[PDB]
Write an enzyme that holds these catalytic residues in place. Structure first.
Site, PDB file in Angstrom:
ATOM      1  N   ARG A  47      60.048   7.770 -44.704  1.00 16.98           N
ATOM      2  CA  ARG A  47      60.583   8.843 -43.845  1.00 16.98           C
ATOM      3  C   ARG A  47      61.621   8.285 -42.869  1.00 16.98           C
ATOM      4  O   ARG A  47      62.620   8.936 -42.590  1.00 16.98           O
ATOM      5  CB  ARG A  47      59.398   9.515 -43.132  1.00 16.98           C
ATOM      6  CG  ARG A  47      59.763  10.644 -42.156  1.00 16.98           C
ATOM      7  CD  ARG A  47      58.507  11.406 -41.705  1.00 16.98           C
ATOM      8  NE  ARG A  47      57.928  12.195 -42.811  1.00 16.98           N
ATOM      9  CZ  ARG A  47      56.686  12.198 -43.270  1.00 16.98           C
ATOM     10  NH1 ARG A  47      55.732  11.511 -42.717  1.00 16.98           N
ATOM     11  NH2 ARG A  47      56.384  12.911 -44.317  1.00 16.98           N
ATOM     12  N   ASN A  83      66.461   9.005 -44.118  1.00 21.77           N
ATOM     13  CA  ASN A  83      67.518   9.597 -43.295  1.00 21.77           C
ATOM     14  C   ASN A  83      68.533   8.553 -42.816  1.00 21.77           C
ATOM     15  O   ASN A  83      69.733   8.821 -42.809  1.00 21.77           O
ATOM     16  CB  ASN A  83      66.900  10.334 -42.097  1.00 21.77           C
ATOM     17  CG  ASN A  83      65.987  11.482 -42.489  1.00 21.77           C
ATOM     18  OD1 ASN A  83      64.964  11.296 -43.123  1.00 21.77           O
ATOM     19  ND2 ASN A  83      66.324  12.704 -42.147  1.00 21.77           N
ATOM     20  N   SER A  96      54.506   6.768 -46.366  1.00 21.19           N
ATOM     21  CA  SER A  96      55.252   7.895 -45.794  1.00 21.19           C
ATOM     22  C   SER A  96      55.971   7.491 -44.510  1.00 21.19           C
ATOM     23  O   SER A  96      57.155   7.789 -44.384  1.00 21.19           O
ATOM     24  CB  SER A  96      54.362   9.115 -45.559  1.00 21.19           C
ATOM     25  OG  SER A  96      53.284   8.794 -44.714  1.00 21.19           O
TER      26      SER A  96
END
Lengths: 83, 58, 286, 58, 83, 83, 83, 83, 83, 83, 83, 83, 83
Positions: C218, C222, C214
């Protein structure tokens, strides 16, 4: 050729229809709490209205990317060029 | 695809963005740091005054 | 040249491997790079990440080596603000005595911020200057380090090594294996406990392995969407049409201004998750 | 996308920078902040003790 | 080859559409609580706004992994290479 | 030809069908809090009514784009012209 | 090979799209209670923040197993081998 | 025509079916708050009933366009003409 | 063979995707109430935690069976052999 | 025609099933509020029961149009022709 | 042979996936209220746990049927014999 | 006949399945409010129980039409008679 | 012969899967308010428990028709004899 052209008409309906569904429910959740808070403190309405438009920019962030890729698929076609 | 055209377009956009940050994002950060600089100066100066504290021997 | 060729060129890293041609060897095509084994390094990404790490470390050391104690100078004032902010964030999240968490949080935050900062400049300025300096008009080169899965995995796997190390160091090996098998469910009798040990492991091991994955994805998600949207906006100007170019510059400015939030949030959230995950390797929550 | 030995190189860089930061960057800066904080605390406590000392003179 | 290209147009629409749907409903929930919290006491609006952006990066995490992969299936294409 | 034309009828139904689903749920969430605010503060209903129409324009922004594109696909199909 | 590869793009879009949908709504539900707890008890924010990030580890765990197996189907393929 | 007409029966079911689904859930939310307000303060009923009918117009606005298009595709047919 | 192998790739995405969607929403609801209780009664936090894990075991029970069978259908295949 | 006839069996199932789903959830929301109002104000039940039937006429308005068209496509057929 | 075998993998994925989705959401709702009750009256927690387990039996009853029929369709498939 | 008969099995599954889904969620909403009212005022139970059966008649009305049409499509078939 | 036997495997997954999904969510809603009522009025729990079983009979009524028809189609398939 015919299947790629027919399946891109439905890909555009999923891109704009799922974005329309999410944006309409998301503003019902956010706007319902704006009218409830505006009843609680009617003198703070100017402040809450600016904070609501900051959050509106976060809802219509991924939806505008999908509405822009869906207009790209109707007036141009990146898949058709791949034969 | 006019590679030169892309460069000109990116250059114009970057110039506008730099202007915005220079006249929008730079002023608050420099002001915030200079205010901290002044709070520390006032605090140190006030301690110096407290250092100059004397009691009458009468 | 076609726009598919420009986008496909931008999505390729500068790779190095010991090819039979000679001791030193670089990939000249996408297929030839993908054909190499896992024993090949993305030189552009190691170059930028090490360079910006040394820049961060150098400007902080210039202040630390001459700290006035009293009135601070222009650089020392900024360095103190970062240290004060990180120490506040650590003390509010962790109640232990470990001296490694604060230096780590400061390093992780400022380094990841600078690795993302090089994304605000026009996407093909650095690649063209690198190509012209190297003398090869067709060289592969990517400046943003966090848009490569390997950089974000390198950061998370290293944080995971510290999480497992501290957990074993304070709870003991038998205690650590115990947390993964004796909690959250326990019983007064062995016959029920033996039926709960697979359920305990099925909950804890899955929730433990999702922490490094994660953190990396993460940070990568983006940033990769951000660089790719800038490459697609740059293709808009390449069409030469006046109205389409006017739309492209307006979208580029709006996307870059929106990105000033993203660059800050991903660096801050990676720092907070790093502090939180390490702080829960010194305590018990079952 | 391509997973490569680049993550091993990145892990080595991460630990080298964190260990240098812990030994040569963070301790000197927090020591300056602690020294300053003690001077600001003493600047109020010593001044208050000297002001209260007058009660004995009275 | 046309089947792989046509099913990639649907894959891109599902990958951006389910992200646009989740991000618009997810921020309508988070945003509604932020406006409600602002109505209790406007002295805490700056602090609550910082806490909202800390959660906005957790909420919009996986939705950007799908938008990144979707724009990577339209221009580049990992399925065409596989024949 | 029939696969492009037939799938267009489904694309149209998905564009306005998902828009109808999201706007009806969104106006039930928004309007439900408007009636609660009017029942608690009856002297403020003239203000709350104006604040509701500001949220209605945001709630119908992406849904009206879907309706416009749906009518465009029915009377001037942009895919039949791409062979 | 064409059907197994074209149906793997749909498999990947469902693994990342349903995971993106569930985590964006889950963090909008979790985070919405954190912002209210942060308003009701201003001194509890540092405790509520660490307790929220424990739940965040439970909330995305199975989603990350799905985003990880989806990336494995996008750059490797366990089905093509089955032919 | 077999394929065009066949897929148009599905299009009509999606238009009226998704519209019915959203309108029925939307009035459950709107009407639930109307009864709550009517029980909280019974003298407000003359006003609350008129405010409910103003919102009901916005709630059904897109659903009625969807039903209008569904009856247009049932008795007339634009797609069939395209051949 | 290729239709059984291709449909198995979708079966795996459907098993994991629905389980990811369900647990992410389930923990948003459960964890949201845990933060609400922790804010009102900070003395109850060590007790509530244990109780949250009791429920977390029930919430993931079927989902773990689902991801276990999904992994089984990727590294082994009881259908391919059935053919 | 076999396919025109077979797709109207699915059209009828969607048209009645989505109507049944919306009407069943919609009355759970409306009826749950009618019981809440009736317990708070037992003396207002004669008025609240009549107001619930006003809302029930709007809630089922589109569902009954869907059921009417679904029975029309079952005992008669506008799509079976045109072939 | 391949269509029956292939469509049974989708049937198994739907029996477990839909059950997993419902059970995960169902326990998020039930457990959320159990933590609220435990925080309110911590002296009754032993009684609330046994009452929660009574409901847990009803909540998973049909889900256990669906995962029991999905493990029956997986090993010694009943539809293969029918053709 | 094979595809008309095969698609009638799915039509029946959608009629009963969507009806069961909506009726089970609908009674969960209506039922929760009946128990909340019974706990608040145990003297009102004789009245609230009769009002619940008046709502239950409205809630299941369209679901029973769906189940009635589904049993008709199982033991008889209006589509097979159209060839 | 094979499409009827293939589609009836999916028809059974819809009947049991949608029923499992709806009843697990329905009991999460119903049971959540049973525990809230019991936590509010500890002495009324033996009275609320019998009322919950009266509602459980309504909640699972249509779901039991769905699983009943699903087991009938699995062992004594009624569509495989009509082709």
């Amino acid at each position: 050729m015919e299947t790629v052209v027919g399946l891109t008409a439905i890909a555009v309906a999923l891109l704009i229809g799922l974005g329309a569904l999410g944006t309409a429910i998301g503003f019902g959740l956010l706007g319902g709490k704006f009218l409830e808070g505006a009843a609680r403190q009617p003198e703070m309405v100017p402040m809450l209205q600016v904070k609501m438009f900051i959050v509106a920019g976060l809802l219509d962030a991924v939806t505008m990317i999908g509405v822009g890729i869906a207009l790209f698929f109707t007036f141009a076609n990146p898949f058709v060029g791949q034969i | 695809m006019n590679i030169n055209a892309t460069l000109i377009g990116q250059s114009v956009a970057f110039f506008i963005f730099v202007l915005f940050c220079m006249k929008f994002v730079w002023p608050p950060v420099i002001a915030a740091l200079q205010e901290r600089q002044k709070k520390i100066a006032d605090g140190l100066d006030a301690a110096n005054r407290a250092a100059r504290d004397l009691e009458l021997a009468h | 040249e076609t726009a598919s060729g420009y986008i496909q060129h931008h999505l390729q890293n500068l790779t190095f491997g010991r090819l039979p041609n000679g001791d030193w060897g670089f990939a000249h095509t996408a297929e030839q790079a993908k054909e190499m084994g896992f024993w090949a390094f993305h030189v552009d990404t190691l170059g930028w990440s090490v360079l910006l790490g040394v820049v961060f470390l150098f400007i902080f050391r210039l202040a630390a080596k001459k700290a006035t104690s009293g009135q601070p100078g222009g650089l020392q004032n900024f360095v103190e603000v970062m240290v004060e902010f990180v120490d506040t964030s650590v003390k509010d999240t962790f109640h232990g005595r470990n001296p490694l968490i604060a230096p780590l949080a400061l390093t992780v935050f400022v380094w990841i911020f600078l690795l993302n900062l090089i994304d605000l400049v026009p996407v093909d300025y650095l690649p063209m200057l690198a190509a012209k300096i190297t003398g090869d008009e067709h060289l592969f080169f990517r400046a943003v380090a966090t848009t490569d899965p390997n950089a974000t995995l390198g950061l998370s796997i290293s944080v995971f090594a510290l999480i497992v190390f501290y957990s074993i160091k304070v709870k003991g090996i038998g205690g650590f294996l115990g947390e993964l098998t004796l909690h959250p469910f326990s019983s007064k009798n062995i016959v029920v406990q033996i039926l709960l040990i697979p359920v305990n492991f099925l909950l804890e091991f899955v929730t433990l392995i999702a922490k490094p994955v994660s953190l990396a994805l993460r940070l990568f998600g983006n940033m990769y969407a951000g660089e790719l949207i800038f490459i697609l906006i740059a293709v808009m100007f390449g069409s030469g049409m006046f109205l389409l170019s006017a739309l492209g510059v307006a979208l580029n400015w709006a996307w870059a201004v929106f990105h000033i939030l993203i660059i800050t949030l991903q660096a801050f959230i990676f720092m907070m998750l790093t502090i939180v995950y390490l702080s829960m390797a010194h305590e018990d929550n079952h």
